[PDB]
């Protein structure tokens, strides 16, 4: 009935949809082999939202990541022919992954994922996993997002987006890439999740006090916040609020679309046993500063709206009182030319080994401290064009940068307004 | 994902029996990169080719990829660039075009050379230039040897030195300076051998290449593919030189003494004490740095250790920079040769940095080039040979012109 | 008279070494004091708003 | 409803608290892993002054670790009960402060302290209604002290309508460990008159005469000095968790023992304590208890009050017991030893009585008495304080720290006027 398409880009795209997928597929009660094996019945009602063979395109341009993707569990679950695949490679070129190797591949994955959307009656939306530092799963990604919105312009669209920070910077390209992917978010993405390794290690480091924290359960991370956000299709609630509804209750004007997220509850496995499940307890944990996954602490400034997405059987009552009581005690931190900035959903299924959890999506104003601390490093190494010519000598001029300057410029200027 | 290697001259093919030495023993579809080897020994004297033939390998390589000339280019640019290039270096491309036509996916060619020689600045320079035209967008791999200050086995050198490097500017898109006195130095200090020859040399040289293609061999946490040191580390189409450096080079006795983590190399990694390169990057402002980890490495800590060496000031970094690096992690831990003199080790790091303590190697050289030439010591040999009196002030124009830029960029 | 300038250069540089470290404790402390007085700022701006 | 919070800093707070939360877990019927084995619902019914439930019979203690060393919480975890306090409370630095007040004060507090108020506000509004906090700590050394000292500052800016417990011991001549006592104990006292609500008084000098008299111990290591000052604190605030036929509860019991607003120093003691040996051979009748409570000899400070008078007294039973026979008997001994009591307030005892007595026995007791004598204590310590202060021994690990010479003037100065307005009350 609604139906949600996936798409996964680049390697930092394939690696956290394929623990996504993982997740779905057990939370769904289905075995790597593709055959179900679940227990209640509530769960085949809808899943088709999702499927059984799983409705995701991976997309990228190096046979590493493919190959680690089928060597997995639950590799066996993708259709072969879902692996729409270049073979060259862009390696952190945003003009390469966005005019030159796109210009190639972009044909063959708009192929796949229109009959992977026509296959189906109703779309809700598309769902699209990828980054802003590299070149192959950010700028195609980026060309992918534009074309979908030629074609389909009344259809929602997510894009789970981490960004890079100079705590943790991986490449020495990283602000040319990340200011030229906002120039084309601004306009084209319904609503964006904005993550980041800095604040993700972070949590690892107080909340979760892992030692080592590979790759795997950052992914685990924004795979549960992506689980969460759509269990209000997938399972009947006692207050249901599907995507679109998420949006227009938190988008107040039409350019403020990039979102901070958290999930509750997360605790060490040494004090798994300590805690209790309670909703005014969770709130705790979702209102906390360091419990955003950004590096944008959003008490340097004002939230515009929020929004809690809760699982479990809960009493409706105690969720008015919390947000409420949050709202009446810090009234500095939340605008106020909005009253009641909080919008809340309720759904009965918990995630499988919980019995209560808890997704946080704020729309703060906080955010332009992270892009005016890109803009920095972008302003100085462009003033001297290092590193330009491995962009300008493949199509992108002097003009593209300054206008992608301009963008990020009168964003903050937008948010400090609406301050 | 394959890469085929070229190895020009005594120096070049003798690294090269190092490096495929390695590669056999590392492989025992991940070999389908190297593996008949992609290779082409050549040279102008046959003895060095002949203990190829000769030797233990005998099998492994196909008997024409093996090439080799009749008469030596007697230590002159010019005669191994006019006189007797002419005549092996057509034979040379007209195989390695061949051997591209066999591979699918090729990411680059690599080449290594020897800039003090006949062969390997003359012929090497040229079969550079017309690889050049042929191909063109494809990556070229330079590893290069410089004359060293003070050690040196020829006397004629600076005038080699500096009639290569000109057109190295222009041709190799990556090249990777290694000089003689800085590795017998690190033998001498880490390693521990007072008595070292080139064997151990270009032992640990093939330790360093091995490093940096393994992110295409095997599949890491991070893989960085040719393509990647391409853009990262370049700022400046003009500016490719790199200090080389890899850690740890440390003895059997001592390695299991000490508690190897990421931390500590990282630092090793970075002290002027352990670079394959005799010059003073503290002299010098960096640009942008590359680290290759290898082993069991998580991303933490290879974040933890590069905040930490952004933070101290003995190493300063440039101005138009400020996220001046790009790291790598791969799962496979290095490999060691029977009878090589490193021992076994979790994790290694191969760093590859480019700085303006380079632009300081360039005047020292253009000293002792400019003494000689003025009173035309030497010219008449490479003047006999075909070339002229102009070519000589030229080369060294262009040379002066590179340091005017490294001046300029460091402000 | 080599022997003893290198000496006098030696000192030169380290007096300029033990400044440079105590350059970064002046820079460190600083950022912390930013901290803790703009939080006192947002406390003075929730007082007037309420 | 009305709730208490734990706090425990240093080492000799840390244990003093490990056995507390045996004892009283113990008395509640909840096992080491932390679950519900009780009999009857009398112990359920007011689990929530302490505990909190976790989940599926899973009652957590409401204590905050916090010291300075790692050695000192390892301890009590590895111990039985150590798996009880969640991970979260054990605010813990990592360098140290080592018995220098100023260390713990200025030097060392001003990084610890902010987590360990977190943890404390979260502790805090984790409950509704507060009925007071309960600090254990020392006044000789110097992160229990000097950063003890400074948490209670802290709370009184924050929470500045609520109660406040502490029980500190005191440095004595006679048991004197560390040699810089004296610098400590005048400044700690010091910052307790402006900041405590009131604090009971103890000193290791009289729990070794109590261990070799009364209870004839041949090793008694700390364990057991810790098993008696946890059986007296639980004593205190037993009217809290349990109900009886005359509840008195801790603010009611402060303000009938405070007649005046800087006399907050308590001493105490505690029945029935007895040797295994003379166990059988008495009875537990209300004249047994009330004499072996009154006996100077069995107070648990080295202060003896024969040596100055009462001013107020107060008494907490436990068990069942006729209040009639309660009041006559306090009224006895006040009435004989009528010199020893203070003359413009008649019947100077508060009295109440609890029905529940503790595991093991049918009858026990807690005296909490306000005296006169404490004057002597701070006259032993402070003349040890002004003999070093001098001429001017150890003044310099403390001064270049940011300490001055006009901060002694000021400690010395509010000790003296404090032992002269003693003084003048007697
Ligand atoms: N690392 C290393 N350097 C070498 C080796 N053999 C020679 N060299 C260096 O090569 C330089 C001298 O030039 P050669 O390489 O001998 O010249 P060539 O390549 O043989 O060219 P021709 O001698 O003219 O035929 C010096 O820098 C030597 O130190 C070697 O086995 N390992
Ligand atoms: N006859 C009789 N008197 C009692 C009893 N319990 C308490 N009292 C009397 O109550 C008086 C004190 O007042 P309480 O009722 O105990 O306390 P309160 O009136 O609630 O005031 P607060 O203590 O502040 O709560 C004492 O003088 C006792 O004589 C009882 O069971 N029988
Ligand atoms: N959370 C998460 N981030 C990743 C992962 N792999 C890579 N990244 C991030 O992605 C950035 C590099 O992007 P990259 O994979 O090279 O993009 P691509 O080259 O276009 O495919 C780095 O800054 C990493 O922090 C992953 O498995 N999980
Ligand atoms: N009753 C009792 N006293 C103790 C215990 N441990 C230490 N002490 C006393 O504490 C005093 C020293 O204080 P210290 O432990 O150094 O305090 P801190 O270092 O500031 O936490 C000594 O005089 C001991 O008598 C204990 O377990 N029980």
Redesign the interface.
Known sequence: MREIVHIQGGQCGNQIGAKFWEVVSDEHGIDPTGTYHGDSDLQLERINVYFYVPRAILMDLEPGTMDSVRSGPYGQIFRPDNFVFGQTGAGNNWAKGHYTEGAELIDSVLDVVRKEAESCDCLQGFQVCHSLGGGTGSGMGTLLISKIREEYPDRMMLTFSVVPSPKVSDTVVEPYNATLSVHQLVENADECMVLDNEALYDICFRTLKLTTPTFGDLNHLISAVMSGITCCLRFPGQLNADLRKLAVNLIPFPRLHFFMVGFTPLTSRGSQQYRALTVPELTQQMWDAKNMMCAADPRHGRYLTASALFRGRMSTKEVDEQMLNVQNKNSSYFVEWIPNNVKSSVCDIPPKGLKMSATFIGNSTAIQEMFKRVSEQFTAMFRRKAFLHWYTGEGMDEMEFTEAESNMNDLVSEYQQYQ | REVISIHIGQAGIQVGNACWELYCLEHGDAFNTFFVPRCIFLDLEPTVVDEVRTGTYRQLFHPEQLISGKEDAANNFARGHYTIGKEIVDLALDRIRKLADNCTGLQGFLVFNAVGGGTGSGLGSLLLERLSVDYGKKSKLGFTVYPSPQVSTAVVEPYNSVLSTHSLLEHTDVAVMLDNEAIYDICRRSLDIERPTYTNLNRLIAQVISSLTASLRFDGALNVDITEFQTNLVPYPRIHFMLSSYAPIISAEKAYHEQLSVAEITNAAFEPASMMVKCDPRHGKYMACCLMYRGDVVPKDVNASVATIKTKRTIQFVDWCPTGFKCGINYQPPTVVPGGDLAKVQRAVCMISNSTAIGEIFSRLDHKFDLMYAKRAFVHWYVGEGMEEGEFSEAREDLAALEKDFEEVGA | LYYLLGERTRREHLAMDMK?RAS?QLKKDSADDLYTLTAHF?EM??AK??
């Open positions: 440079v970064q947002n701006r929730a708003e309420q």
